[PDB]
Amino acid sequence: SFFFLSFHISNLQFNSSLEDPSTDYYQELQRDISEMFLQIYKQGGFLGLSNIKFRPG
């Protein structure tokens, strides 16, 4: 099964780097968030997550 999840990161400013998935900052944040999710969900059946979409909030 699949679950769509949206949330805000309330302590980070959206900036021009986060509009561009090829930037170092975009990739670092996507990596670090992905790693966090692999810590949150430890179920044997948890496979992982998609690539991440960032938008201004």
């Binding site: 999840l5 990161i9 966090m36 948890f46 991440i52």
Partner: protein, 48 residues
């Protein structure tokens, strides 16, 4: 703020949408303390 959107994948029979949401909301404290991410406004949907 930064809005973050993603999809999670589990094998059949593992979890439901409420559990996904509760487990994420319960992690807010650790997300802030360990990852320095202040997580808010969580929304979770089943994707058919």
């Amino acid at each position: 703020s930064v809005v973050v959107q993603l999809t999670l994948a589990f094998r059949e029979g593992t979890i439901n949408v409420h559990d996904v949401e509760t487990q994420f909301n319960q992690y807010k404290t650790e997300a802030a303390s360990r990852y320095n991410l202040t997580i808010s406004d969580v929304s979770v949907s089943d994707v058919p």
